[PDB]
Write a protein that binds this DNA or RNA. Structure first.
Ligand SMILES: [Mg+2]
Ligand SMILES: [Mg+2]
Ligand SMILES: [Mg+2]
Ligand SMILES: [Mg+2]
Ligand SMILES: [Mg+2]
Ligand SMILES: [Mg+2]
Ligand SMILES: [Mg+2]
Ligand SMILES: [Mg+2]
Ligand SMILES: [Mg+2]
Ligand SMILES: [Mg+2]
Ligand SMILES: [Mg+2]
Ligand SMILES: [Mg+2]
Ligand SMILES: [Mg+2]
Ligand SMILES: [Mg+2]
Ligand SMILES: [Mg+2]
Ligand SMILES: [Mg+2]
Ligand SMILES: [Mg+2]
Ligand SMILES: [Mg+2]
Lengths: 85, 123, 122, 70
RNA sequence: UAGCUAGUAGGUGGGGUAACGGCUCACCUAGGCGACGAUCCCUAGCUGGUCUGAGAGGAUGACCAGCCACACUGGAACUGAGACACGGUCCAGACUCCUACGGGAGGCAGCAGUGGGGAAUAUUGCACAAUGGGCGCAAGCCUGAUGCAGCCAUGCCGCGUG
RNA sequence: CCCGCAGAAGAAGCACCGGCUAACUCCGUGCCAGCAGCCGCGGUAAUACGGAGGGUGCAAGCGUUAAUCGGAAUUACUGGGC
């Protein structure tokens, strides 16, 4: 580069690795919930939902995702969990 | 007529055509004088008109009149070309600009010297 | 082993795409052209605004052969196709300014130093 | 390069070859007569001048009758 | 240029987005657009406005201001409130350059400037003193924005040459 | 920007002048040379070519070319026709 764009490149790669780890973990827990749902066990699905809810809420707090994205995940996972029966 | 007919198909303007297409909406162009010769006029006219076949920078190969009495142009002279046909020379739609860019001025001109590219005398 | 009627790819950017060997130069009855060998070619395929035209007869130096070169230790270097660099018909002096694909040390001579410098490998 | 084989006889073929040679050399060395450029006839030049003068008189009579003698 | 369209048009559900949405996916329905011109082709940044015109209109979009798009070419995302980013990242390409031949670097459509093209269009200027902008509690630093200066009768206006 | 100094000093050109269109003669040239936007001009008395004198217009500009609209009611809606 030619500027302070070098520091931004370094910081952006660092934040890219960090956010990638965080996003992977978050959607891994979301996948946990979805797999429990498509298995058919409401209890396991609820356990996975309770495991993931603080994760997505804290990530929406950190700014990894948006509050709307976290709320949408929670909402349309609760919907499937309830309609599972 | 018939406002209804006009609403259907409106009135079409007469799209004008340029009589100086080689200029391509430029005031002048630059050429090379692929040929220099004389032509006879048409009609009732009778003379030996001095004219040059000129290749322009945009690729156009046109015919340009050399005005004034006497010129120094030849088979490779780079000249400047402005609009204006000759009206008795068929196919000559341009004039050579005298006193500009390797086409010399006219000798001994005292009147209308800005045309023909003649500088002011000693006085 | 390039002979007459062999089609070669063009390893420079002179504009030619496919050329045909029409003569293996140097020696009566000479059959094949290895790598460092000059051949007479005609251009069978060229690009529209290239430095050469289709149907042009000129010279070329082989730079890659499927047959390959053998090294003094017995090793072999083969390529997946036969390529050549086009040369001016009077002085060899490659026509293009770039050279694509690798070449071999067999080309390291005084007349192909331009090629050995422009090549991206060996 | 001529090939004369019209005849079963070599002497006929030889004379035919020489005849072809002579005919070809004649047709290839005969010079086309030069075309000198022609001018308009002076009758037509006077016609041009006369038509011009007549239209000159008519145009002088036409148009603007200014001075007005007034 | 008279037909065009198969995610096409709609529906259900899932996913996705900041957000609605065929945005995406599976299934279902067989629709949807079009002579009030679809589709296709050519050309084109749009507007306030400008020029012309008595108007209606025609032409036009230099400067200035609003919007859009682009940033060597083609893609892509990352970071971030905001970019798919002019002086950031990655990949590919063409070109230019360095190389110890293994590999690397670059992007004036910022301001000057050069070459080129052209009928044709300017200085490789000074200063952040104004006004703005970034950062900073500030002081301040940075600012080719900007303020000015240079060049050019290019225009408009004024005056002189008694 | 103001004041002082000196001296008319240091500071006019361009186009046009047949009609349109404002402003005319002489000379040279002789359908040539050339001019021209249109009509045209020029073959021995040319206000039309070239120079001069005189004049007209504009003026630190003036002409030419290009381009747009106008004139063009010459696409007419205002506002045409068969
Ligand atoms: Mg949903
Ligand atoms: Mg839907
Ligand atoms: Mg259409
Ligand atoms: Mg364009
Ligand atoms: Mg009007
Ligand atoms: Mg560029
Ligand atoms: Mg993000
Ligand atoms: Mg940037
Ligand atoms: Mg840049
Ligand atoms: Mg140039
Ligand atoms: Mg400042
Ligand atoms: Mg700095
Ligand atoms: Mg008058
Ligand atoms: Mg005019
Ligand atoms: Mg006389
Ligand atoms: Mg005269
Ligand atoms: Mg009109
Ligand atoms: Mg009528």
């Amino acid at each position: 580069n030619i500027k302070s764009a070098k520091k931004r490149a370094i910081q952006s790669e660092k934040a890219r690795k960090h956010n990638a780890s965080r996003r992977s973990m978050m959607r891994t827990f979301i996948k946990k919930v979805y797999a429990a749902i498509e298995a058919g066990d409401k209890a396991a699905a609820q356990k996975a939902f309770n495991e993931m809810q603080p994760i997505v809420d804290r990530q929406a707090a950190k700014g990894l995702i948006h509050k709307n994205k976290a709320a949408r995940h929670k909402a349309n996972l609760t919907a499937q969990i309830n309609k599972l029966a | 007529a018939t406002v209804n007919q006009l609403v259907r198909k409106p009135r079409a303007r007469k799209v004008a055509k340029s009589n100086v297409p080689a200029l391509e909406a430029c005031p002048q162009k630059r050429g090379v004088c692929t040929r220099v010769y004389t032509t006879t006029p048409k009609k009732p006219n009778s003379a030996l008109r001095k004219v040059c076949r000129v290749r322009l920078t945009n690729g156009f190969e046109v015919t340009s009149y050399i005005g004034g009495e006497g010129h120094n142009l030849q088979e490779h002279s780079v000249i400047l070309i402005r609009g204006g046909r000759v009206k008795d020379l068929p196919g000559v739609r341009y004039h050579t600009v005298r006193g500009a860019l390797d086409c010399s001025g006219v000798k001994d001109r005292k009147q209308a010297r800005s045309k023909y590219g003649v500088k002011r005398p000693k006085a | 082993m390039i002979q007459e009627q062999t089609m070669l790819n063009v390893a420079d950017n002179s504009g030619a795409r496919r050329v045909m060997c029409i003569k293996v130069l140097g020696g009566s009855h000479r059959r094949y052209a290895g790598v460092g060998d000059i051949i007479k070619i005609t251009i069978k395929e060229a690009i529209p605004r290239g430095k050469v035209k289709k149907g042009d007869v000129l010279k070329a130096v082989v730079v890659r052969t499927k047959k390959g070169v053998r090294r003094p230790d017995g090793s072999v270097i083969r390529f997946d196709g036969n390529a050549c660099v086009l040369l001016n018909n009077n002085s060899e002096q490659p026509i293009g300014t770039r050279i694509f694909g690798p070449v071999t040390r067999e080309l390291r001579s005084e007349k192909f130093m331009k090629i050995i410098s422009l090549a991206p490998e060996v | 390069v001529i090939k004369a084989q019209e005849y079963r006889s070599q002497e006929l073929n030889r004379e035919a070859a020489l005849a072809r040679l002579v005919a070809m050399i004649k047709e290839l060395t005969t010079e086309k007569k030069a075309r000198r450029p022609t001018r308009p006839t002076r009758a037509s030049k006077e016609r041009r001048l006369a038509s011009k003068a007549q239209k000159s008189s008519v145009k002088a009579m036409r148009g603007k009758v200014r001075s007005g003698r007034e």
